[PDB]
Each structure stands twice: as C-alpha cells, then as structure tokens.
Symmetry: D2
Subunit: 297 residues, 4 copies
C-alpha cells in the first residue's frame, strides 16, 4: 500500500496533504508537527472530509515509528514569518532532531525536502540522517522551472506543459533559466520576445505571490507531489530536483532520473559556457553556507 509522511503541517505541508488526499494518492498518511494543536486540527478536519471524499486515506499524527514503512517522507517544516535563506537559522536548528528521529524510526524510503533554503537543508538532512545521498533530494528548481514555463506559456499562449527547458542552480538566490534548453513549438526559444522580461516574470513571480497572500503553497506542493508519485511508481522520470551530482560535490538543481530508490541516474546537459559558469557559482554559494552551518548541528 502507499504511505506518505509529512513533517511540518503549515501552509505548504497542508496543501501537499490536501493535493494527495483529494486525488486519493496514498492509503496511509503520517502528519508530524511540533505544534500539537495545529496538526490535530488538520487531522480531524481531513477526517471530517472522508465521508464526502471518493477515496479513503488513514491519518495518524506525531508518530515517528509509523514512518518505518513509508515510501516517501516530505519535509515542509520552517517558519514563513522569516521569509515575509534568513530562515536558515530556524530550519537548520530543526534538522538535527528531525533528522535523528527520522533515522531512528527505521525509515528507508526517499526523503523529499521543501524547507528553505532547500539546497542547504537538503544537504544537512543527508548529513544528519546518514541516508545515501540518492535517497535525499529537494524540490529545488522544479518550482522555478514551473514559473518559467508559466511565463513562457503566457507569452506564446501555450500549455505550460508544452514548454521544455530547465532552471538550474540554487533555489531562491542564484538559480537561472538555461535558455539553451528551452524550446517552444518546435523551435529553441533563443532563435525566437524579451527573454529577460520572461525571466523577470519567472524570478519575481514568487515574490508577487508571497507579497500578495503571505506565503506560496500550490506551486511547490504540486512539485513535491509530482516527485512523490515518481518515487512510489518507480517511473524513472527525468525531473529537475536538488540532487548531489558527483562532479558538483554539493547539492544543487540539475535534471536527474527518479524512481523508487531516489536518484537512479544523472543527466547531461550541453550548457553554454555562460550557463556552466553560473552553475558553478550556485555550487559555490550553497557549498559555503553549508560549510558555515554543518559544524553547528
């Protein structure tokens, strides 16, 4: 049967849970949150929906041992008030205990991290749990790429799913659009529009949402659900996620092949020199911030 664990039932974690429960994706769910009254409130509210939902799902709360046979565990803990990377003092303070309980529960599935700064927190989670790096991944620029596809989609009046290409690097700071990989309606977008306008709409689009309602939830929740379904189904799907490539030596977003055991293979992009240059800049940024904080745990 399918079992998913969600750590941190805030705006994003609760949207992840609603997206999964609304489609009846999993059979068993484990909600874990430091704030007890909140998570119990969400459990009951979801259990009240069950008589009127089409598919059934079981929900247990704050039970680490229940994670032992979970397929996927999604980490959505953090403090959005610190965003309203400065969040690093908060989320990095939480990874030691969350990571140790996770390791101790007997969990051996794939861990998907959303907590920001996603690249650095993904790395510290890998570091505390001791899980193989291919079992610990982050949404990273899967969200950024979806904003890029939305922006390019609006410009050409196309289905965003019909736009190909990726955003690489460090989510929420040096990530960039690899315009050499983007293609729309059979042609490479660079041989076609104000690309920087599109890139600005893509990059500033996330602040517009936070600015408008105080957080972001549907965009990133859906990116996590897509990765969680690829893992459980062992799809061997190519997705841009925050993964540790051998050549990079640090977590950063770059397309990879995802299946039931996590990262099954790396992909290879023919990036311009410009794009490779930016990619190592992101690597260095993540690496340094990670370096400063890993001793502190």
């Amino acid at each position: 049967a399918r079992k998913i664990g969600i750590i941190g039932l805030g705006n994003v974690g609760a949207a992840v849970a609603h997206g999964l429960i609304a489609q009846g994706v999993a059979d068993d769910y484990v909600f874990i949150d430091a704030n007890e009254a909140k998570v119990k409130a969400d459990q009951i509210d979801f259990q009240d929906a069950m008589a009127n939902l089409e598919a059934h799902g079981n929900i247990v709360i704050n039970d680490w041992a229940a994670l032992a046979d979970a397929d996927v565990v999604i980490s959505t803990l953090g403090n959005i008030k610190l965003q309203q990377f400065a969040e690093l003092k908060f989320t990095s303070s939480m990874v030691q205990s969350v990571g140790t309980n996770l390791k101790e529960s007997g969990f051996h599935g794939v861990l998907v991290v959303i907590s920001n700064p996603v690249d650095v927190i993904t790395a510290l989670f890998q570091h505390v749990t001791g899980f193989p790096a291919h079992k610990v991944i982050g949404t990273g620029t899967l969200l950024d790429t979806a904003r890029m596809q939305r922006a390019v989609g609006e410009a050409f009046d196309l289905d965003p799913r019909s736009v190909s290409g990726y955003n690489l690097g460090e989510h929420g700071n040096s990530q960039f659009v690899a315009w050499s990989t983007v293609r729309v309606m059979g042609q490479p977008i660079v041989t076609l529009i104000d690309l920087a306008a599109i890139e600005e709409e893509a990059r500033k689009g996330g602040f517009t949402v936070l600015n408008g309602k105080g957080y972001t939830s549907y965009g990133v929740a859906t990116s996590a659900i897509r990765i969680a379904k690829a893992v459980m189904a062992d799809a061997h799907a190519e997705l841009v996620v925050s993964n540790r490539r051998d050549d990079m030596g640090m977590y950063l977003s770059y397309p990879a092949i995802i299946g039931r055991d996590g990262v099954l293979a790396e992909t290879t992009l023919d990036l311009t020199t410009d794009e490779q240059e930016k990619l190592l800049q992101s690597r260095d940024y993540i690496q340094q911030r990670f370096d400063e904080i890993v001793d502190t745990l």
Copy 2:
C-alpha cells in the same frame, strides 16, 4: 465543458479551488474576491502548479461576465450587531445583484454562517428559483457524525448511514432514527454504545479544529465539491443540503435529490415525534433570523 465560479477566495474558497484543481474537475475557473492582491496571488500560484499537474484548468479572476455560462457557482461569503447585519445583507445584495446581472443561470451553492439564512437571502435577492439556490447545510455536520460513529465502531465513515438535520451552526441535531451501522439501526445497538457521547465527539471535533487552526476548511470545502459534481453530472444523488421544502416554507437541511437543475425532488424521512419536533424548532429559528436580516436590506 465544465466551468466553476468561486466567490470569496479565503480559507474555504482556496481549499475548494485546490480540491477541484488537484483532481482536474473543471476546465474553466472564475475566482472572485474583493482583495485583488490575494486572488491574483492565488491565481498565479495555481498557474505555477499547472506545469506539474496532470489536468489543465484555466483561471480568470474578478470578471463577473465570465460567470454567464458557469455550471455551478460557490459562494463562501458570510449597535454593532445591527451594523453587522446591515453590512452582511448589503454584501449579499451586491454580490447577488451582480451575479444575477451576469446572466448566470446554473446552480448556486452557498457556504456561510448562518448558512440557511444566508442561502435564503441569496435566493431572495437574486430572484433565482429556490431549487437552484442551495447551501451546504448539515452535510458537514453529518460527515462529522459519520466520523465519530465510524471511530466508535472502527468503520469507514462512508459506511455509516443517517443524517444531521435542521439548522447548521446551532439547533441542528443527529436524527439517530436514520443512522445504521453494520446492518443494524444504531438505536438498537444503543439499547443493548452511548449515543450522547458520540454526539459530543462530533461537536467537540469542530472545536478542536477551530482551536488549533482558527478555522475549518477541508471538511466544508469537500462538501461543496461533492454537491458541485452531483450538479454537473446530473446525478440525481440524494444529499442532505440546505433547501426550501414546500412543507417547511423556509430553508433548512434535509435530504433532497440533486441534479443539474438543482433540487430535483424532496425525500421523506419517517422521523420520530421528538425528531419531528426538533426539526420544526430549527425551522422557526431560521425563520426568525431570516425576517430579522431581510429587514435591514
């Protein structure tokens, strides 16, 4: 194609939207909200999710004319006491008039508080035939009774029959003479389970949600979604909703047959005399509160 309009993109409204978009229920969505920043932030956030979602949906905001061919419209709006009444009736009149003027002729589903009064007010202000104006009512309350009973007998809530009738938010009651579990009327098993305790847990349930979250969303959003699908599919499904029965003359929750035209027929429950008595008490309360608010129009 399927087109759904949602008026009020708050906690309940955004959850209704996410519930529909996660499943790809409708093709076109119309979001209407007084706060342009919030509704615009939600639209962009949902559009960001489209690149990683399985079904596509088109989203327009604050365009009253777009509701003309909407199949269903869901409204989540709802000295100082006098002022509050005056402002609530004003809002229902403005929204209702603009709704009427858009040319919309589908079914209007209201989520609000008190739902029966506000539903009757929308019926009054729009001039839509009463069978096309229904409120979620005790569908949520019934689902909570189903959860409590289900937990008491380690049963799927969907396998618990029976309903909560009357006034949602105050005098509604469990019609225990309609509740069956595992082939037996629960009253019989009670005479040999403590029904009052079960009633306590369901009510207590709602308070835990309010206390830990500050509001409830998944339970009620799912109710509206179930009703919305019955309407678009012309299911002729029996659901307990807030509707105006000829014999009651006011709006209250009682099972009815829902289809593409709204209430297609009424049901007839053989209630006990005490149950029948509570039903009429409920009706008298809704009448009083309706006369009172309609007088501030």
Copy 3:
C-alpha cells in the same frame, strides 16, 4: 507502493487492468495468463498507452515470484460435466499452489462462476485464512438491482441502499427488506411500484449484455476494483462479497467489513423469515456443489 496481480487476462481481466491503469491506482502490476501471446500483446498495448497517460504503472507478465509482495490478487479464472469439474478443480489447484508457493500473503479476490464454489475451492487449496479469500459474489447483482431501482425512481444508483444476498448465478435474491429509496423503505412504497418487475428488469439486463456482447466485463470488473481499493486503503468498508460466515460455515454473499487483512468483521441484517429461508436454501446449494467438485480433486 501498491502492487496488484491479475490471473487471467481475458475479457474481464483486461477490463480490470484497464480500469486500474486509467486511474493510476497501482504502481506495479503482475499479469498471469496461460496464453503468452495474449498477455504479451496486452502488456505492450498498455505500455504504448503510458506515454499519453497521466499516471505511471509497471507491468510484468507470467512471473509468479513477483506476486510475493502483491497487496491484492484478482483471479478471473472459471462424461462432459465430470470432465469439466475435473479440469476446473485441477486448474484451481495448480494456480492455488503456485500462488501459495510465491509467498503472496495479501487478499485474494475471486471473479468466477460459480464464484462462491470456486472461492471456497481456492481457500481450500491455498490454505489461506478464509478472511483473506473473498469472491465478488452478489456485489454485481446488487449494483444491477440499484440500476433497475434507480432507473425506476429516476435516481442515482449510488443512492439506492440494500442488497442482493446468496449465491451468485442462481439462488441469489434481492433482500427487499434492506432496500431504501428517498428515505423510505421500498416495501412500503410498493404497498402504495412493482418490485417483481424491478427484480426481473435487473436480471433481464444481464441477459441483454450477454446477448449483445457475449459476456459482461465492466460491471463485474468495477466490483473487483472497488473491493481492491477497500483492501489497500484498509477502509473497513461495508461491502457485500462472497465470504465465509461462522453461522453459515460455507461461502455465500452477505455484507462484511473489508480492510487490508480481508474480512475484518461480519454484519447482522434483520432479514424477514422468507429472506432467511432463501438464504439458507442458497447456502445448501453452494455446499452441495462444492462437495461435488472438491470430490474430483
């Protein structure tokens, strides 16, 4: 993850696989069929559909060891008379033995004819606990009664309660004392509708399907799928399936509580004396036909 095995990829088995695959219900599928070319054609046909489907599924064929960790296995297998009994009992023993030897320890759902006899035979040969071996039984006849009553009262078949009990295929009957429509027990509405005609209508339909297509598939396939979901989700859902009651000591259709471990509990209907009589008559026929075929093992 969710894994389902299907034994016998004929009209029914392929409809079951397509229904599950069109919704992405399981992650892994194991198809077992005596005809290598037919099962291989279906596997390739479904793998050709994966590029245009929303959910992914892995399909392996004729590999018994793969059933070891399957959640559910659905079996669609089913002078002269003695010869046929002999070949049939032999087939159930060969399949049953290989299934038992695979390590499989989930729930076995049997689609056959006579489904109650073949279900009991499989239980007998495998040695699996009776609660883990169930047949679809009269879940398909109940759904036909619901269709016929639903068409009679212009209702949603899902809104018609009640069941068909007994032996699927010959002595099963509508337990009219359990059927309710629009809040009223249908018998009272009959005292005022012709139940006999309704009962006949339901049956006629089955014959209409057999004569126009030569077999029935969607109706019974969907019954198996619903049971399979209740098992993987551990729903504790009340479903009418062929199960072995202590009071009956032989398989027959009577509602029961279904969960991950199969039959979790029995239900107690208050049938009328005629109903109890036909139920026992039904049971005597199943017992006798079972006795006959187990003698040929």
Copy 4:
C-alpha cells in the same frame, strides 16, 4: 458540463469509453453504433458499473440529436476483421452517411478520427461534413510516437514520458521517426545503441499486439483521450495529430497546438533534409489515395 460522443463501440470504442468512465472524465456520453445490440449491451454494462464507480456519467445510445452540444465526438467505426489499408473500402462507405448525420445533428465541437486509414478518413470526414479543417483532426502518429517512446524508454530504462520527439507522416505506412527531434537524458538520441533496432520495435510493435490478440486498443484509446482532454480544457497543448497544414494542403501528422476550437496553431520543426523528403513522400501517398477514393 462535459459531453463526449463515440461513434462505433468496437474494441477501440469501448476502450475509449472505459478510460473516460473509469476516470469520470465526462458527465454525459452518447454511444452510437450500427450494431444496436452491441451498443445497448455496453450501455447497460457501464450502467451496472455505476453503483461501484466513484464518479457519475450518463449514457444515451444512438441519438444523433444528443450530439448537438457534445464537446468532442470520437469516430472509432470500422471493421477490424478486415485487418486480420484493407478497411479503406469499408470505412469510406460509412463516412458519407455518418458525416451527413453528424453534420445535421447540430454538432459543432471537435471531431477526433481514429478509423483507419486515419489520415485519409480524417480528410474525407472534413470533406463530407464541411466542418472547418481545424475542427476535424485524427490521432495520426500520436500512437506511433507513443510506441517510439516505449521502445526508447525500454532501451534507456526511462519513463516513456521523459522521451521527447515525434514520428511524422502517414500512420500505418510511410510514417517515420524524426530522429533529429528525439532526445533523452538531456542529449540528442542520434549523439548517443542501434536506432534501427529501436525503430523496428516501434514500427512493428502494432503487428505484435495485433497478432497477439487480434486488435489493438489501449494505446490508441489513450491517445484519443489525451486529445479530447486538451480540447475540453482548452489547453493549447502541443500534440502530434493528423491535421491539415497549409504548406502540405493535405492531412498528415505533424505537431499542432490543440484547444477547444481544434487546431489553434501550427508548429515548425527544424527537420533534416531527409526527414523533409520523407514527409513530402508521405503527403503524396495521402494525397493520391485520397483523390483516388473521392
């Protein structure tokens, strides 16, 4: 509400119907088939399924007037027995009456043609109904692209959905794999294996299926359903379908942008000289056999 009509409830027809009903994609369904007892049988069989399905759907049979407000109409009529270009004589006979009835129902949505030979029957359907060419399209090499993605996916142990590229031309004859458009794991397939082996698996893959059970159904039924969903949701999705491009002046498969009004725009691929040549070759066979038939 969503309303889909299916003409011809055979192997492909009933598969399209089950894929939609299992997911609860539409609200209303119109089943039309010359063999009345087979359509009436599937109707009741699906209505028997309804009490145990999660979503509701309404089914009416052989009512052309009910197609007046259908969103999409899928044509899956034919005779698979003749396939075991064989059906062209039979399927061409049907197009006049079916097309006329369809035209007179008041239907004005998108028509999706599956019936083989799909490109020529798509052209005759457009030609007989008088419906704008952009509102009349066929599955074409959407099924063939999916087989290419299966073969390539199997070879690289990838999700078939992660394989990009298209198969162009005429389905079941001159169709080919535009290997310049295919890429896997960030690289061009022709830069990375024997593509002819893969090519053959993909090309012969329909025979194997057909020889193994006597017809093909899930592959093509799912391709039709993907198109139908792009139409009703007005996705503006890039899909390879049989459409009539102006530069070709004849139906053939080439990627197009699909929405509620049918083809909304054409794409332009940077095909190799050879690839360009094969596509025109396909156009001639379609053009020629089309003129030959009417």
